[PDB]
Design a protein around this ligand. Structure first.
Ligand SMILES: *CCC(=O)Nc1cnc2ccccc2c1
Ligand SMILES: *CCC(=O)Nc1cnc2ccccc2c1
Ligand SMILES: N[C@@H](Cc1c[nH]c[nH+]1)C(=O)O
Ligand SMILES: N[C@@H](Cc1c[nH]c[nH+]1)C(=O)O
Lengths: 418, 418
């Protein structure tokens, strides 16, 4: 007896579960199409060199990696953004900007807590757009998908902030910019852990209380006005946030978005606006997350800087949420027609009827093994047949077949079936 | 400058290539729906124990495997069928038969020839059907997909045979059935390599010339009648083949299928009918391949035998074929509308028009960065916009917007856009 359970921390998708998965993914695809993005994909396997960012990120701590027999260090992608940029660099100047690329890759992490080791992540990125109009498009896409699954501005939101704010606090206070990204990582873990633990974890990177307290204060500012008092309306993070909120208002999604100076995200490459989907009952971790990352491509060796922004939207939390709101009922399998031979002698004919139904775009099954009509009808019910088509010898001589709608069973000519 | 090329032997799918991939996969999905199959999926990662079959198969010689840090021996699936059976066993008696399951998994092999290490394989299996009516359904599905891509009975075919034929030759000649599966593996490599090399490779497994010559002769029989002379019409492989050909005839695909006693397939678990898609110009390797495998589930420790049959249909050869026949032209990207602000002051309004178009199911982009109208029109062309919608201040005061079909530019009220 072989092991039926899957590999540690992975998921099987038998039909029922796969229909839930499809319900979700169809939304990601439709939203992408609505917003005008183009699909792409890259190998699940990447060179390990692609991810070592030296910022102390939780994503680079828990990487599912190994060695090919041929010696090359490779990894199951923990995320898609580095792969995207690998494609964008490959294209060079034959890349046409602006580009709006999306994908639904499965991504992989490794842990000792026997926790999931995989998830599917919708990725949406806009490449080659300087202005916050891209973030606006991105957030609006996030919200569209959410409403498409049947969530409202009363159920979820999008918290927004800009790392440029903290960028200045750290620059003015006298800390070399190399220390910045690792700080964002530490400051991102604020609600999750104590306050004295963060300040000690910051102090470890060579930062005195004056410099640390400035950081504490600026995360717990509640408005843009308060950000303005702290760094002026002159500040570009302020103009960007104002423009961002103005454009999302105009698009019609003002009720979905709000400012939150605590939001930094845990990844290193974000440089400007950042955002984080959340549920309004405070029950769940983030629904999705993204931001602007203007330097990643410079860092990958692009001769000229390429502005980007995008987000990830995982398959785990959104499902947990939809399930709580009872917006993910099991959809049962359907099929238009189940062709039923009265007996084996009728099989050849039933096969020609089966041909016609399919030829006309209908979905159809035919009873495969020898079985009684009554068992065949039971089978039709089980598989969600809208209609049973009985093929009996008597009707066949007349050029007819019996048809029963499942939601007597009337005689019908061949030609009127379709 | 980071490495832009992907990992050895894998493929990137930037937008253009991904549209080809989608063209193909949409066919696999539609054919599956037409034939009434249900989608499933399992982890790309499986325990290594799942594949060691001891038959000398080329698939188990070239397996892309490695060790998790946690010690477990795991592998990137070289095929889907063992994973399917893992799911089917997990379900036990809550599995409803007959079951018609399909999937489009990426599968992985390892080689020293720096050759592809991955492909996408459409898998279609019917579970819980004793009679050849399943193989009929399977082959007909194979052909449907092929015609759906625009191939004809004049371009490709399906060669059919039954391993039960060789089963008897080997049994009558006095060879323990353990030697059978390894023979099928060797006999499958017949066209690819010399004849004396196969007979020496057979002799290595403890088989004298009398027993070997029987095998040689029975592969090069050209008709079913000749199979009948050799093993009688009594024989069930003969009744099965006759029934198979009769049912495919009746379905309307007689011209696509033909008998070929050389066909055995290279995998161990096939027990009855087997089949192999081929192109009629003799140019390419197999388009797809499948068969009946009635014992795999017994072998996996099922308390009672579960009859199955199915096939694999890869993404490599079919593409090569379609490309030769010029049936895979690059489909360029489209989008319904590109909303164009006359200038930045018009952006808020353009965003509300963008809302309306999307709200109505249209796909739409909006000019994201600051740019001239003329550049905006050039952009609209590039991305396959069917229609440009210019939003100017003069028209806006009237409650109008300018609309230009891209395959003057007339004024239109907001409400008539959609
Ligand atoms: C329920 C939340 C969850 O499973 N999240 C998750 C799973 N797997 C990965 C793999 C790689 C990166 C992130 C995640 C997140
Ligand atoms: C062009 C044919 C081809 O690439 N075939 C192929 C590629 N990759 C795999 C991986 C696993 C098993 C089979 C194949 C076949
Ligand atoms: N890869 C990021 C999401 C993202 C896409 N684009 C920018 N950020 C994440 O894992 O959260
Ligand atoms: N897994 C088989 C195809 C198959 C599916 N079902 C039965 N056979 C192959 O790799 O060729």
């Amino acid at each position: 007896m072989v092991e039926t359970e899957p590999v540690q921390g992975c998921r099987d998708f038998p039909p029922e579960a796969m229909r839930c998965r499809r319900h979700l993914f169809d939304v990601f695809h439709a939203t992408a199409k609505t917003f005008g993005f183009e699909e792409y994909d890259a190998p699940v396997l990447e060179s390990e060199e692609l991810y070592i960012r030296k910022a102390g990120e939780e994503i680079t701590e828990q990487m599912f990696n190994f060695i090919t027999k041929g010696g090359h260090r490779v990894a199951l992608r923990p995320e898609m953004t580095p792969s995207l940029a690998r494609l964008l660099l490959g294209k060079g100047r034959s890349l046409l900007l602006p580009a709006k690329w999306y994908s639904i890759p499965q991504c992989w992490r490794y842990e000792a807590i026997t926790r999931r080791r995989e998830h599917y992540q919708w990725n949406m990125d806009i490449v080659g757009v300087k202005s916050v109009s891209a973030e606006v498009e991105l957030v609006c896409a996030a919200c569209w998908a959410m409403r498409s699954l049947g969530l409202s501005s009363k159920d979820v939101g999008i918290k927004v902030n800009s790392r440029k704010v903290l960028q200045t606090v750290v620059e003015q206070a006298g800390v070399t910019s190399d220390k910045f990204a690792p700080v964002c990582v530490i400051v991102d873990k604020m609600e999750k852990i104590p306050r004295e633990e963060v300040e000690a974890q910051l102090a470890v990177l060579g930062l005195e209380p004056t410099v640390v307290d400035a950081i504490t204060t600026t995360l717990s500012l509640k408005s843009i006005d308060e950000i303005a008092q702290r760094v002026g309306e002159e500040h570009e993070a302020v103009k960007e946030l104002r423009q961002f909120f103005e454009q999302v208002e105009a698009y019609g999604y003002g009720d979905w978005v709000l400012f939150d100076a605590s939001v930094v995200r845990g990844l290193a490459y974000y440089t400007g606006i950042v955002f984080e989907g959340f549920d309004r009952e405070g029950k769940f971790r983030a629904l999705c997350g993204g931001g602007r990352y203007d330097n990643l491509l410079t860092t990958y060796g692009s001769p000229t800087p390429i502005p980007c922004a995008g987000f990830g939207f995982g398959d785990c939390v959104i499902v947990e949420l939809l399930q709580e709101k009872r917006l993910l009922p099991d959809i049962p399998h359907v099929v238009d027609d189940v062709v039923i031979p009265f007996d084996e002698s009728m099989r050849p004919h039933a096969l020609a009827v089966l041909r016609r139904l399919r030829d006309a775009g209908r979905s159809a099954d035919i009873i495969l093994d020898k079985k009684k009509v009554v068992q065949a009808f039971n089978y039709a019910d089980r598989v969600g047949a809208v209609r049973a088509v009985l093929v009996a010898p008597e009707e066949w001589e007349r050029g007819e077949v019996q048809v029963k709608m499942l939601r007597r069973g009337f005689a019908v000519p061949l030609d009127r079936l379709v």
